[PDB]
């Protein structure tokens, strides 16, 4: 993993030692180069994992996530350099440094062979994320958003730290491989019930679970565009990845401990999809849609089937790409009208035709239109849930109906109808914005040709 | 602010005639029943006091609501018609011409010269029409959404730009 980690670390000296006007060029070029290198991790094995050293390993679950992170960094850089054009050289370098630090922490988080190292790296992601949100966000609400995000995450994470050190003291190891191979069944007792809750709640609040999600609208809305991109695309997936890793020590306690969480997510996907139907803030609507897809991921991980895990992996990848695309599309309109209100700028298809096409593609992917990998993940999870209990088809069908309704409603209200009469500053789409959408959408569709690359290690 | 009694009687006359036309369809039948309807409206044409005239209007409106055609004929481009607001997707605002690339504009030199002439007109006349609006609007602000004509030679009616330069009904 050092052939990936060290180039990323080298982004910092290069960023700080480059000319004031070569900052974005250099960072973009070499982050794309690092993303090219990360693709070689997709050469996986059927049975074993890629166990490089004692401290880093890679399997079919973490390799697509690593590729997604390394890909997100350059797109972040293209999205940021517009609203940060008037900033000072040192402050731009600090923003780039925060993004690089976040990518480095995420890369080591997804490959950490030990549970406590994973914990520290997954907690380290808070610091640059919080800095981005609170320093470079636009509104006075960014401070409260930062506090919510920080303290929700930490209230989740500290009991996990206690549980992890207890597990290390009783089992002798926190090594992922050892944990799998020396797996003990978890008995039915209050001690084990609370150990389960401690092992699960941090990833629950990270995803987030419905009812523990109130930080996410604040944080994903108040953050600058790159912050929203990472928060929606890679940071939510830390909960799903960690839950997939740690559920191997929670059986058979997960059989009945998951019932409250299964109920919460199955109903809260309905609840948050309905909320999207009435959201007056475009960025808030996009933030609220992440909760439903992540609720589907929660159900898939909690029912513990090969098909459910495959669907959850594919859904995490597809949601990362699609949610980041939607945030970028909303940000392009925000940078023109300086507002997130959705009915402010209507009838945009007759002013920005290719951007309207990008909007249609993003809405279609959020719709989970087949054969997109969004649909593959959603359908696999739906089938596994149907096996788990047939009655799950009522709620999941309702959810896909409501998802269609709000996705197409957003498309219609922003792109269609009559343009607003007094808004006379909708300049033509820049090459940079169109390239941002294209680099969001093209790899999403190419994955349909090789879907096994994102179906996880249970494929 | 409000509709007078005469206005309301006329609106009901027009609406009832149109729904009668939707019911009758054929032109001779519509002519016959339209003359009968006009006789109904002419029966109380000269009514002394407006209390019973208004009661007649109320009864006529209740009758109209009972007997209206569920789907009356609608002119295609009128609200609720089948061609209503069909051409909004082509009505590009005129400020988009400024954001054209200089190579798009060079294909239309004469048009953009005329457009610069209109823009110079608008820029020049703007101050003396805000002035006229101030000099004509009584204290407390406007009471009606009406606007004045230009009153002296050389001036343009205030707030004329977006009325005069509005998109055509069949733009693209």
């Amino acid at each position: 993993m050092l052939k990936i980690i060290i180039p990323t670390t080298m982004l910092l000296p290069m960023t700080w030692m480059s000319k004031h006007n070569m900052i974005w060029i250099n960072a973009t070029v070499h982050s794309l180069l690092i993303s090219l290198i990360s693709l070689s991790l997709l050469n996986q094995l059927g049975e074993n994992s890629l166990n490089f050293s004692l401290t880093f390993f890679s399997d079919s679950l973490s390799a697509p996530l690593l590729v997604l992170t390394t890909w997100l960094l350059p797109l972040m850089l293209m999205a940021s350099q517009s609203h940060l054009s008037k900033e000072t050289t040192t402050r731009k370098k600090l923003y780039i440094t925060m993004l690089i630090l976040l990518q480095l922490f995420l890369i080591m988080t997804f490959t950490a062979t030990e549970l406590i190292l994973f914990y520290i790296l997954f907690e380290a992601t808070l610091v640059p994320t919080l800095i981005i949100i609170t320093r470079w966000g636009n509104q006075t609400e960014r401070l409260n958003a930062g506090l919510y995000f920080l303290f929700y995450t930490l209230a989740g994470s500290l009991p996990l730290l206690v549980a992890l050190v207890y597990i290390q003291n009783t089992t002798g190891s926190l090594n992922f491989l050892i944990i799998h191979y020396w797996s003990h069944p978890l008995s039915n007792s209050w001690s084990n019930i609370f150990m389960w809750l401690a092992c699960i709640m941090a990833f629950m609040v990270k995803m987030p679970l419905y009812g523990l999600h109130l930080w996410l609208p604040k944080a994903h809305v108040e953050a600058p565009i790159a912050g929203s991109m990472v928060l929606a695309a890679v940071l939510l997936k830390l909960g799903g990845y960690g839950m997939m890793r740690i559920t191997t020590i929670l059986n058979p306690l997960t059989n009945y401990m998951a019932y409250p969480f299964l109920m919460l997510s199955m109903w809260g996907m309905i609840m948050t999809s309905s909320i999207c139907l009435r959201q007056t803030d475009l960025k808030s609507l996009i933030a609220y849609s992440s909760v439903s897809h992540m609720a589907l991921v929660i159900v898939a991980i909690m029912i513990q089937t090969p098909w459910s895990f495959m669907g959850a992996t594919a859904l995490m990848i597809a949601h990362g790409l699609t949610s980041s695309m939607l945030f970028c599309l909303a940000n392009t309109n925000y940078e023109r009208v300086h507002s997130r209100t959705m009915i402010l700028a209507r009838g945009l298809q007759t002013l920005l035709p290719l951007m309207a096409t990008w909007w249609l593609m993003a809405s279609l992917t959020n719709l989970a239109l087949p054969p997109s990998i969004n649909l593959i993940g959603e359908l696999f999870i739906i089938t596994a849930s149907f096996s788990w209990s047939n009655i799950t088809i009522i709620l999941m069908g309702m959810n896909m109906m409501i998802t269609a309704l709000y996705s197409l409603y957003m498309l219609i209200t922003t792109q269609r109808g009559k343009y607003t009469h007094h808004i006379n500053n909708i300049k033509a789409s820049f090459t940079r914005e169109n390239a941002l959408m294209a680099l969001h959408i093209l790899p999403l569709l190419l994955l349909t040709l090789n879907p096994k690359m994102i179906l996880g290690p249970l494929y | 602010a409000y509709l007078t009694h005469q206005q309301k009687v006329l609106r009901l006359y027009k609406r009832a005639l149109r729904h009668l036309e939707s019911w009758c369809v054929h032109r001779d039948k519509y002519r016959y029943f339209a003359c009968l309807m006009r006789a109904r409206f002419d029966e109380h044409k000269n009514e002394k006091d407006m209390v019973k005239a208004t009661q007649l209007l109320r009864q006529a409106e209740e009758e109209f609501w009972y007997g209206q055609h569920p789907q009356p004929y609608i002119f295609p481009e009128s609200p609720g018609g089948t061609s209503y607001e069909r051409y909004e997707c082509y009505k590009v605002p005129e400020w988009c011409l400024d954001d054209w690339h200089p190579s798009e504009k060079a294909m239309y030199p004469d048009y953009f010269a005329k457009r610069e002439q209109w823009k110079r007109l608008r820029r020049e006349s703007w101050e003396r029409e805000v002035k006229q609006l101030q000099e004509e609007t009584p204290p407390g602000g406007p009471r009606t959404e009406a606007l004045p004509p230009a009153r002296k030679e050389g001036d343009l009616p205030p707030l004329w730009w977006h009325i005069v330069t509005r998109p055509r009904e069949r733009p693209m």
């Binding site: 033509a428 | 590009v92 733009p171």
Partner: peptide, 12 residues
């Protein structure tokens, strides 16, 4: 008769 059609910039 040909009229000028107003459209957004298609250049970019």
């Amino acid at each position: 008769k040909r009229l000028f059609i107003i459209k957004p910039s298609g250049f970019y």
